[PDB]
Amino acid sequence: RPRFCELAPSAGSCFAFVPSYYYNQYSNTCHSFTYSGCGGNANRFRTIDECNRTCVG
């Protein structure tokens, strides 16, 4: 799992509503979460297919 997938998606940076995908190493999977346009960190994905294929080892 690349370390970019374990980051904290800083959605509190600005007021936005863009539902995106989180990566959960603890359960070797991904799960939909809430993101923001501004701010955020790299663990955010647009689909579980990208999230799983790149970090679900």
UniProtKB/Swiss-Prot annotation:
GO cellular component terms listed in the entry, alphabetical order: extracellular region
GO MF annotation terms: serine-type endopeptidase inhibitor activity; toxin activity
Disulfide linkage: 5-55, 14-38, 30-51
Keywords: Disulfide bond, G-protein coupled receptor impairing toxin, Glycoprotein, Protease inhibitor, Secreted, Serine protease inhibitor, Signal, Toxin
Glycoprotein as UniProt keyword: yes
Family: Belongs to the venom Kunitz-type family.
Protein name stated in the entry: Kunitz-type serine protease inhibitor NACI
Included stretch of the parent chain: 25 to 81 of 81
